[PDB]
Amino acid sequence: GNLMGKRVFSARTVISGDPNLELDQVGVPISIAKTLSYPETVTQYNIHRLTEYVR
Amino acid sequence: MIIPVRCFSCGKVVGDKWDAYLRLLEEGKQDALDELKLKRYCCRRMVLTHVDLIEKFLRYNP
Amino acid sequence: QKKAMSSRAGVSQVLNRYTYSSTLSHLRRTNTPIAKPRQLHNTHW
Amino acid sequence: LHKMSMMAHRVKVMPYSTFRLNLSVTSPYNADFDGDEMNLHVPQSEETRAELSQLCAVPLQIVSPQSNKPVMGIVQDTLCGVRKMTLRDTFIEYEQVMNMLFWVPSWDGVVPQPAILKPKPLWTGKQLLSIAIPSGIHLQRTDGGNSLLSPKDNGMLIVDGKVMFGVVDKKTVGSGGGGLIHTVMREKGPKICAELFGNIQKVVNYWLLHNGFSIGIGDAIADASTMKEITHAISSAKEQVQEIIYKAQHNELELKPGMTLRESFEGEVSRTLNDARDSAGRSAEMNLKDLNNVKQMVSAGSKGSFINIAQMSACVGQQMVEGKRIAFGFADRSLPHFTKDDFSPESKGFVENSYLRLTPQEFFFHAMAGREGLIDTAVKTAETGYIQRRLVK
Amino acid sequence: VYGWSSLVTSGVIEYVDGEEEETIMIAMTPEDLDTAKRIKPTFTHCEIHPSMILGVAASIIPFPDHNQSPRNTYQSAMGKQAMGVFLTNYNVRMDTMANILYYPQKPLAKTQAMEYLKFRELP
Amino acid sequence: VPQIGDKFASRHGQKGTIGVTYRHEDMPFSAEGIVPDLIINPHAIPSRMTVAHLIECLLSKVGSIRGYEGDATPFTDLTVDAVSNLLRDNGYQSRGFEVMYNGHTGKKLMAQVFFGPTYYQRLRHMVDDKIHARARGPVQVLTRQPVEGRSRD
Amino acid sequence: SSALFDDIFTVQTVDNGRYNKVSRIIGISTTNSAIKLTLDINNEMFPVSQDDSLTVTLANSLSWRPPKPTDKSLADDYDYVMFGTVYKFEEGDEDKIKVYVSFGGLLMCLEGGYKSLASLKQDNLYILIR
Amino acid sequence: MNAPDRFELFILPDDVPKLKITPDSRVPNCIIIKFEREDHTLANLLREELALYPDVTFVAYKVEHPLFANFVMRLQTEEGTRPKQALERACASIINKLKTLDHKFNEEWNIKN
Amino acid sequence: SKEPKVNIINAQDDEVELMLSDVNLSLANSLRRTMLAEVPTLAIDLVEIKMNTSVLADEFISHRLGLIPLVSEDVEEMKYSRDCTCEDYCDECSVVLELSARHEGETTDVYSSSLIKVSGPGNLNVGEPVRRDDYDQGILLCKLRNHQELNIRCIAKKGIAKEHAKWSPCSAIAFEYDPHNKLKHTDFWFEVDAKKEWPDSKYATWEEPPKPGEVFDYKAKPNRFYMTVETTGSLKANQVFSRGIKTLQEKLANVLFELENSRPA
Ligand SMILES: [Zn+2]
Ligand SMILES: [Zn+2]
């Protein structure tokens, strides 16, 4: 119950297909994207963009 | 639960038409819709299907 | 109650109130403590 | 329960409260939109991500190892319509042949020479639909009466990545073996083929948006005389039963080795009603023109089959539980509305009516029959899962 | 002054349990017992009406005699999950969760049975 | 308010959720003006087999025009052949189908459609009561793993 | 930039196997008694019944420009001009040949044996009729 | 909950031009015009009047996706003739056609009782 | 006079049948929808309820009033609250209304007629509870019993059908063309005979029948469209056509204007 499988940066809602999305995409509700994050280390390639995203 | 202003489907107003209808029945004993000017079924169904609950709600006290 | 849970839970529930036809249905309901019983028998007509 | 029940997708933030997934990637998860929900997980390391994109990307998954064939094809609308658009009768004029080429993103920016110039310069689906197929894609088919000039426009032949002849449907663009998809994956790669969907889609879905398509009771009604020709295929079938019942209620029949005199009685009644029912439907099947929408949705291969039409326009069928026609729950009878010992079909559960038209009796048996169905779909559901689980551990 | 109590006190109708049922013969359509309608195939009793073998659920389903039975069985469940009006006093009720459809509407097509399911007044 | 995801259904196990929402212009239409409130797919008919659904529509398209209540009640003496004749007296195709012009271009639809008033129940289960997303939230005590249920985050 | 075929045939028959707007017709040649012709066609744009005198042509020549060529070449001195490609090159016994032409969806077959240096194996191909 | 504010179907948002014109590399003398806060109402109308200037070699348009009210218009013309112009012209021809219409509908009306 | 041409058929106050010929369908349709969705109107938008003992809830009534049709004659000489330099609203861009309803007559009704126009109309046709009702109180807002009160305060604003349906003054619009399928923009469904099974349209009489002997004409295009423009009030059926014809034009304008603003640089 707790080891071979646990609840885990995850989200779930209702699906409805969209005929204008590349096969491999998956439209995510803004709401959700504004909730789930991603630890990206600061690097002189993305500092500029990150300092913006942060502001 | 009161009459629906304007028909969902097409948009034509229909708030006023309630009393006219519920009247052309009781008295003139009547088609009603047709004369009330409710042509295509979209608005037709609007009136012909309303179940005026507000009446019963109104039967409550304070 | 007591150290007697050796009873049956289900008897008496929380009356539905989603819709009218919901409530009616709920009252006219039957249970059956636990491939043949689930069947719609003739006698059921 | 699949390697494909989980796949890595490109994120697209969009409005409205719902996960918007592509249709062709429907059957892998096996979802529909009647309320179904989906779980999403987010990688966290730089490699975690990579591991997700280099092995779990949806494009890599197109060819399923379990059945060495793809596992995602073109469903519903896109399929159904791709069929129409293909017929020799389907023609499109400049105004649209343009807005169609525009929707293909990879479009080289070159309008192909019209399949017709004489009076009006027109094109055919087969032509434009082909602008979606990459160069070097060679496909050959052969159905029934199929030969390098497919009369009934059967088979399928695509050379250099241009549809030469034949109509396109489930067989040519489904999650099947020869599958143009199966081939484009193998010949071009995960990527190229993965894009192929969207295109074949975008063109077709768009086209359908304008050509329209529907279904209504009208698609389920049988010719004036056919509805008769059938009735009497049940009457006669009824007597070929009354007949063997008379010939049984006289002991005038021998026991087929290994079977009981009684059992052998059923064995025929069953084989009589079944063959009756079988053509009952078949009369209507050929009675539904190349315009019947329901037929169309069956040829395209996007929904339902013969059986379906049958039970809706002809005869519903015989009902059954535990393998034998509606039992005698009531001592020697089906319902209290019946005379004892009635072994006939109108008693044992044979619904002679069509959905378009059932009688109480028919309607009931039918229920008892379906009831058995619903049963295991609600039992085999988790016992199957156990057997699964074991194989795993 | 002519209830159901009299329809019974005159031997015009009987209460048949499942057991007693076994030894009676019931006629469907009281009367009877066109190339369109459905083909129809000692009596002691007749059926008040076949459309009475249904319970609350199906009673609201239009032409349940025209759908694949397993489907009727589904709608038989979703109904207990639609919106409407569950009472009129609702405006004086302090219950957790309750939903009222802004504007109801009795159906364009109905079951004669709906008449006892007050459905027309509580769609 | 109904939203691009909320679930609905008729009285025929014909359940479905919202995929998008268009307006009047964008919507396909019929000469009369009449436009659909709902557009369900022809594909949910062939294998579902629920035909009465198809019938309730026809009947109800008449009861719409006639003002008379349309009986759908079980085993009665009403037929598809009959209703169709009643619908021809009013003006539209004897089978329901109507001509429609594609809301984007105005050009007619090469096909005809089964356009007709049908009852639809708005089942509970709206998206915004389910949509849930978490990233490091309330942790359990004994385990120290996350906690269960979207309600408790 | 030359022609590759010229010959008048006679409609042996016209077939519409379930096609409201197209018919596959066949007809023999008036010169040799070896040349047959099988061709699908738009009955809507160019009607045709059994027993007609049509002149069939081929060849390659006079993106795709709209009209404007009102003041340009017009190798359209006919009343039906399709473009397509030919696929298989079959040999029906003897030294009799037969090339198969498909026009973006419209099939065709030719038979005989005297374009041993005229009918090429390219995609190019314009059909003409009058 | 997640749906935009209605007024996003016509109002340009923070620094955004109705038009954005980009050259197309796929083929010579071609362009793709991004129209912001618009639809078929205006798209298809512009698309149409361009297959009218038989000087326009190509003209199709499209709505990338329905959630967003935008649309792309691709145009290609004859030699040394700039499409942008053909867009102007075919665009002007449109107003006139309507200018006439407005008028022809007004005198017409007055004659009613 | 010039290009496209009209030929009005029976026309009234709440309709305007007419034939529009010599135009591309493409363009007819465009105008079609423009009426349906983008003509400036005037509807209540903000509702400040003070007291309300009605059985209906706040936002339920709020909805109702959003739909009540207001005058929109000189709607064009008013500004969108978004462009007006006033914090919130004012006479120069809005119309304020009052509504008081005390239950006295021991079932008292609330008709749209019962609305006051507290702000300064500045002398321009607008902000009036469009009544077409026979008696003189069009649109029953709602009913109330004994001592149930109800005090509001509405604020109307410009806006269009895109922003909300409560705006578009159209409300249903007929459109047909080539009643005799000559252009073959359709494939009739049928069991035996399309022609007999498919209703002939009342529009078939202003165009000539098919005529068998003729082959299929191809070079022919969609010309002439039989319409009908119904109105809900706010704007006169005639204007709901004119203004439409014009807004579409204003748009076609900026597409040419916006163009210019991009040449200098
Ligand atoms: Zn209406
Ligand atoms: Zn102001």
Residue G24: give its domain's CATH number.
Answer: 2.40.50.140
How far is Cα E71 from Cα D204, in angstroms, rounded to an integer?
A: 32
The rounded distance, in Å, linking the Cα atoms of D301 and D304 is 8
Q: Which residues contact F26 (CB under 8 A, 6 or more apart)?
A: F103, F104, H39, H40, H66
Q: Do H3 and F4 touch (CB under 8 A)?
A: yes
DSSP bridge partners of G102: G85
Q: What spacing in Å lies between the alpha carbon of B6 and ligand 1's midpoint?
A: 8
Q: What single letter denotes the amino acid at residue I149?
A: E
Q: Give me the residue spans of the domains in chain I.
A: 3-40+166-263, 41-165
H85 CA → ligand 2 middle, Å: 40
List alpha helices for chain D, DSSP H: 46-54, 76-86, 94-103, 125-130, 170-173, 180-188, 190-211, 226-246, 263-285, 293-299, 306-313, 345-348, 360-376, 380-392
Give how far Cα D338 sits from Cα of B53, D199, D344, D365, H96, Å.
Answer: 47, 61, 11, 13, 81
Residues from chain G contacting residue I187 (CB–CB below 8 Å): 20
Cα–Cα distance between I62 and I49 in angstroms, integer? 9
Rounded to whole angstroms, how far apart are CA atoms D326 and D273? 14
Which residues of chain H make contact with D20, given a CB cutoff of 8 A? none
How far apart are the CA of I122 and the centre of ligand 2, in A? 13
Q: Given an 8 Å threshold on Cβ–Cβ distance, is A31 in contact with H65?
A: no
Domain that holds residue H10: 1-113
Q: Rounded to the nearest 5°, which phi and psi values hold at D115?
A: -75, -5
Structure tokens at G58: 């081929």
Chains A and H touching, counted as 3 or more CB pairs less than 8 Å apart: yes
3-state secondary structure of E40: coil
Chain F contact set for D221 (CB, 8 A): 80
Per the listing, tokens 């779980």 go with: D39
| Pair D50, A18: CB distance under 8 Å | no
What DSSP string runs through B37-61?
Answer: T--SHHHHHHHHT---THHHHTTS-
Q: Name the CATH superfamily housing domain D78-211.
A: RNA polymerase Rpb1, domain 3 (1.10.274.100)
Q: Give the CATH number of domain I41-165; options: 2.40.30.10, 3.40.50.720, 2.60.40.10, 2.170.120.12.
A: 2.170.120.12
Shortest alpha-carbon distance between residue F37 and chain H (Å) = 18
Contacts of I215 in chain G (CB under 8 A): 47
Contact assignment for H17 to I1 by CB distance below 8 Å: no
Count of domains forming chain B: 1
Does D342 carry a binding-site annotation? no
Which ligand is the nearest neighbour of the Cα of I158? 2
Q: Which residue has the tokens 């072994």?
A: D343
Method used to obtain the model? X-ray
**Cα-Cα end-to-end distance for chain C:** 39
Strand D10-14 relative to strand A25-29: parallel, antiparallel, unpaired? Answer: parallel
H helices of chain C, in order, are 20-27
CB within 8 A of I95, min separation 6: which ones? I42, I70, I117, I119, I121, I126, I127, I155, I156
Closest C-alpha to I161, from I35, I251, I53: I35
Nearest in space to D153 (alpha carbons), one of D161, D163, D168, D165: D165
CA I148 to chain centre: 35
* Eight-class DSSP state of E91: G
Q: Which residues of chain H have a CB within 8 Å of the CB of F20?
A: 66-67
Of D329, D336, D372, the CB nearest to C41: D329
Residue D113 DSSP one-character state:
P
CATH domain I3-40+166-263 topology = Gyrase A; domain 2 (3.30.1360)
In Å, the largest CA–CA distance within chain A is 45
Q: What is the Å distance from ligand 2's center to H10 Cα? A: 21
Residue D169 annotated as part of some ligand binding site: no
Residues in CB range of D114: below 8 A, 6 or more apart: D121, D122, D123, G64, G83
CA distance F143 to A6: 11
D94 CA → ligand 2 middle, Å: 50
C-alpha distances in Å from residue F65, one per residue of B12, B28, C25, D244, G24:
17, 20, 33, 53, 47
Q: Which two three-digit tokens encode residue D310? A: 């049958």
Nearest Cα residue to I80 out of I167, I157, I162, I160: I157
Reported in sequence order, the residue ranges of H1-113 that DSSP labels E, i.e. its strands, are: 19-23, 30-36, 56-62, 70-77
* CA pair distance D209, F101, nearest whole angstrom: 11
Ligand nearest to the backbone CA of I170: 1
Q: With contacts defined as CB-CB under 8 Å, which chain D residues touch G75?
A: none
Confirm if G78 and G129 have CB atoms less than 8 A apart.
Answer: yes
Q: Which of B36, B42, B47 to mutate to test the interface with F (most CBs of F within 10 A)?
A: B42
**Cβ(B4)–Cβ(B50) below 8 Å:** yes
H or E element: which one contains E61?
none
Ion ligand 1 neighbours (CB, 5 A) are B 7, 9-10, 42-43
I90 is in an annotated binding site: yes
Resolution, rounded to a tenth of an Å?
7.0
Residue G109 contacts residue D147 (beta carbons within 8 Å): no
Do the annotations mark residue B10 as ligand-binding? yes
CB D325 within 8 A of CB D274: no
Q: If you search the block for the tokens 């319970």, which residue do you land on?
A: E55
G104 touches chain H (CB under 8 A): no
D230-233 long-range contacts, CB within 8 A, separation 24+: D230/D280, D230/D283, D230/D284, D230/D314, D230/D315, D231/E39, D233/D276, D233/D279, D233/D280, D233/D283
What's D250's DSSP letter?
T
Distance of alpha carbon E49 from alpha carbon E30, whole angstroms: 9
Interface of I with B in 20-79 (CB under 8 A): 53, 55-56, 64, 67-69
Q: Is B30 on the interface with F (CB under 8 A)?
A: no
Chain F hits for D213, CB-CB cut-off 8 Å, are 42, 111
Burial class of residue A48 in the structure, from the number of CB atoms within 10 Å of its CB (0-12 exposed, 13-18 middle, 19+ buried) = exposed
CB contact under 8 A, F148 and A12: no
The HSE-up count of residue B2 (CA atoms within 13 Å, CB side) is 25
Q: Are D98 and H60 in contact (CB under 8 A)?
A: yes
CA distance I25 to I178: 11
CA dihedral H45, H50, H53, H56 (to 10 degrees): 180
φ/ψ of H59, rounded to 5, equals -170, 105
Split into its structural domains, chain H has a count of 1
Q: Domain residues for B24?
A: 1-62
Using CB atoms within 10 Å of the CB of residue D127, give its burial: 0 to 12 exposed, 13 to 18 middle, 19+ buried: buried
Give the phi and the psi of residue D257 in degrees, each rounded to 5: -25, 125
Residues 3-42 of B with CB under 8 A from E: 4
Among D117, I247, E100, which Cα is nearest to G66's?
A: D117
Query: CA separation (Å) from A29 to A13, A32, D40, F18, F133?
Result: 9, 5, 12, 15, 10
Q: Look up the CATH number of the domain holding residue H18.
A: 3.30.1360.10
Q: How far apart are CA D36 and CA D28, in angstroms?
A: 14
Chains B and F touch (3+ CB pairs under 8 A): yes
